[PDB]
Design an enzyme around this catalytic site. Structure first.
Site, PDB file in Angstrom:
ATOM      1  N   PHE A  44       0.863  -1.202   0.000  1.00 46.99           N
ATOM      2  CA  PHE A  44       0.000   0.000   0.000  1.00 46.99           C
ATOM      3  C   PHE A  44       0.894   1.246   0.000  1.00 46.99           C
ATOM      4  O   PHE A  44       1.978   1.218   0.616  1.00 46.99           O
ATOM      5  CB  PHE A  44      -0.868  -0.057   1.288  1.00 46.99           C
ATOM      6  N   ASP A  45       0.436   2.317  -0.616  1.00 49.30           N
ATOM      7  CA  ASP A  45       1.168   3.576  -0.719  1.00 49.30           C
ATOM      8  C   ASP A  45       0.143   4.706  -0.777  1.00 49.30           C
ATOM      9  O   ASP A  45      -0.919   4.528  -1.365  1.00 49.30           O
ATOM     10  CB  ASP A  45       2.021   3.564  -1.981  1.00 49.30           C
TER      11      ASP A  45
ATOM     12  N   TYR B  75       3.318  -2.042 -14.707  1.00 47.42           N
ATOM     13  CA  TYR B  75       4.756  -2.471 -14.686  1.00 47.42           C
ATOM     14  C   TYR B  75       4.963  -3.735 -15.511  1.00 47.42           C
ATOM     15  O   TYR B  75       6.103  -4.235 -15.565  1.00 47.42           O
ATOM     16  CB  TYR B  75       5.201  -2.659 -13.238  1.00 47.42           C
TER      17      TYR B  75
HETATM   18  C1  LIG Z   1       6.880   6.335 -17.619  1.00 45.28           C
HETATM   19  O1  LIG Z   1       6.782   5.116 -16.846  1.00 45.28           O
HETATM   20  C2  LIG Z   1       7.136   5.183 -15.521  1.00 45.28           C
HETATM   21  C3  LIG Z   1       7.454   6.325 -14.851  1.00 45.28           C
HETATM   22  C4  LIG Z   1       7.837   6.263 -13.497  1.00 45.28           C
HETATM   23  C5  LIG Z   1       7.855   5.059 -12.835  1.00 45.28           C
HETATM   24  C6  LIG Z   1       8.267   5.013 -11.305  1.00 45.28           C
HETATM   25  C7  LIG Z   1       7.121   4.650 -10.350  1.00 45.28           C
HETATM   26  C8  LIG Z   1       6.195   5.855 -10.218  1.00 45.28           C
HETATM   27  O2  LIG Z   1       4.913   5.325  -9.591  1.00 45.28           O
HETATM   28  C9  LIG Z   1       3.774   5.304 -10.315  1.00 45.28           C
HETATM   29  O3  LIG Z   1       3.807   5.620 -11.511  1.00 45.28           O
HETATM   30  C10 LIG Z   1       2.552   4.971  -9.619  1.00 45.28           C
HETATM   31  C11 LIG Z   1       1.583   6.111  -9.822  1.00 45.28           C
HETATM   32  C12 LIG Z   1       1.974   7.373  -9.048  1.00 45.28           C
HETATM   33  C13 LIG Z   1       2.057   7.020  -7.609  1.00 45.28           C
HETATM   34  C14 LIG Z   1       3.074   5.926  -7.299  1.00 45.28           C
HETATM   35  N1  LIG Z   1       2.758   4.718  -8.169  1.00 45.28           N
HETATM   36  C15 LIG Z   1       2.963   3.438  -7.773  1.00 45.28           C
HETATM   37  O4  LIG Z   1       2.874   2.513  -8.614  1.00 45.28           O
HETATM   38  C16 LIG Z   1       3.366   3.148  -6.377  1.00 45.28           C
HETATM   39  C17 LIG Z   1       2.930   1.693  -5.931  1.00 45.28           C
HETATM   40  C18 LIG Z   1       1.397   1.584  -5.970  1.00 45.28           C
HETATM   41  C19 LIG Z   1       0.929   0.173  -5.536  1.00 45.28           C
HETATM   42  C20 LIG Z   1       1.464  -0.205  -4.150  1.00 45.28           C
HETATM   43  C21 LIG Z   1       3.016  -0.089  -4.147  1.00 45.28           C
HETATM   44  C22 LIG Z   1       3.495   1.268  -4.596  1.00 45.28           C
HETATM   45  C23 LIG Z   1       4.833   3.346  -6.189  1.00 45.28           C
HETATM   46  C24 LIG Z   1       5.720   2.565  -6.901  1.00 45.28           C
HETATM   47  C25 LIG Z   1       7.090   2.717  -6.648  1.00 45.28           C
HETATM   48  O5  LIG Z   1       8.066   1.999  -7.342  1.00 45.28           O
HETATM   49  C26 LIG Z   1       7.684   1.034  -8.310  1.00 45.28           C
HETATM   50  C27 LIG Z   1       7.534   3.570  -5.686  1.00 45.28           C
HETATM   51  O6  LIG Z   1       8.935   3.625  -5.406  1.00 45.28           O
HETATM   52  C28 LIG Z   1       9.600   4.553  -6.235  1.00 45.28           C
HETATM   53  C29 LIG Z   1       6.676   4.299  -4.976  1.00 45.28           C
HETATM   54  C30 LIG Z   1       5.269   4.157  -5.156  1.00 45.28           C
HETATM   55  O7  LIG Z   1       7.217   5.060  -4.031  1.00 45.28           O
HETATM   56  C31 LIG Z   1       6.430   6.106  -3.456  1.00 45.28           C
HETATM   57  C32 LIG Z   1       7.262   7.101  -2.700  1.00 45.28           C
HETATM   58  O8  LIG Z   1       7.899   6.441  -1.602  1.00 45.28           O
HETATM   59  C33 LIG Z   1       8.405   7.671  -3.608  1.00 45.28           C
HETATM   60  O9  LIG Z   1       9.111   8.676  -2.797  1.00 45.28           O
HETATM   61  C34 LIG Z   1       7.963   8.449  -4.858  1.00 45.28           C
HETATM   62  O10 LIG Z   1       7.567   7.348  -5.839  1.00 45.28           O
HETATM   63  C35 LIG Z   1       7.303   7.786  -7.118  1.00 45.28           C
HETATM   64  C36 LIG Z   1       7.372   9.023  -7.566  1.00 45.28           C
HETATM   65  C37 LIG Z   1       7.102   9.299  -8.942  1.00 45.28           C
HETATM   66  C38 LIG Z   1       6.710   8.240  -9.755  1.00 45.28           C
HETATM   67  C39 LIG Z   1       6.630   6.952  -9.287  1.00 45.28           C
HETATM   68  C40 LIG Z   1       6.915   6.706  -7.936  1.00 45.28           C
HETATM   69  C41 LIG Z   1       7.529   3.854 -13.524  1.00 45.28           C
HETATM   70  C42 LIG Z   1       7.132   3.936 -14.876  1.00 45.28           C
HETATM   71  O11 LIG Z   1       6.751   2.861 -15.642  1.00 45.28           O
HETATM   72  C43 LIG Z   1       6.858   1.549 -15.083  1.00 45.28           C
END
Ligand SMILES: COc1ccc(CC[C@H]2OC(=O)[C@@H]3CCCCN3C(=O)[C@@H](C3CCCCC3)c3cc(OC)c(OC)c(c3)OC[C@@H](O)[C@H](O)COc3cccc2c3)cc1OC
Length: 128
Positions: A55-56, A101
């Site tokens: 969860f996030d 993903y």
């Molecule tokens: C152009 O394509 C991409 C661009 C960026 C990314 C990086 C991951 C990006 O996250 C997301 O796109 C989605 C939607 C926006 C909110 C975060 N998202 C997630 O998928 C969450 C998931 C949701 C289901 C439960 C687990 C977490 C997410 C994925 C992460 O990595 C895969 C992640 O770690 C980086 C994450 C939060 O961390 C949240 C927070 O702790 C970080 O500080 C900021 O994270 C992000 C910031 C910007 C974009 C994304 C993550 C991936 C991409 O394609 C695969």
């Protein structure tokens, strides 16, 4: 719960009509405008793996999550889904792996071939 409701009731907002991004509206927003590619959007959100193992939330930071539409900042499903939202709207999205993903996944959080669920609140958006 919320994910099963989207599977049963959600609108298919994909072009290809492959059910890759399913949406329901939980709260109607204001006015008519929805954001353009290149716009800076401000959201709150909660996300989870559809089986609930991870969860996030934005409510962790207690600050909006900010990203720009169409700039490759987020998974494809978010560019598709947020583009359909009005200011003030709350939506639920159920997302197949092809719009998130994929088979690669993203360790350690995201297994291969993962369906995702999000609640998104569109707070505001502004031009570049
Ligand atoms: C152009 O394509 C991409 C661009 C960026 C990314 C990086 C991951 C990006 O996250 C997301 O796109 C989605 C939607 C926006 C909110 C975060 N998202 C997630 O998928 C969450 C998931 C949701 C289901 C439960 C687990 C977490 C997410 C994925 C992460 O990595 C895969 C992640 O770690 C980086 C994450 C939060 O961390 C949240 C927070 O702790 C970080 O500080 C900021 O994270 C992000 C910031 C910007 C974009 C994304 C993550 C991936 C991409 O394609 C695969």
């Amino acid at each position: 719960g919320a994910p099963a409701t989207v599977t049963e009731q959600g609108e298919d907002i994909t072009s290809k009509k492959d059910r890759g991004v399913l949406k329901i509206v939980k709260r109607v927003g204001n006015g008519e405008e929805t954001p353009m590619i290149g716009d800076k959007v401000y959201v709150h959100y909660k996300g989870k793996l559809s089986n609930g193992k991870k969860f996030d939330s934005s409510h962790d930071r207690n600050e909006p999550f900010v990203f720009s539409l169409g700039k490759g900042q987020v998974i494809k499903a978010w560019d598709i889904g947020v583009a359909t939202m009005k200011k003030g709207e709350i939506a639920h999205l159920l997302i197949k792996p092809e719009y998130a993903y994929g088979s690669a996944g993203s360790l350690p959080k995201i297994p291969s071939n993962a369906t995702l669920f999000f609640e998104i609140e569109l707070l505001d958006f502004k031009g570049e």
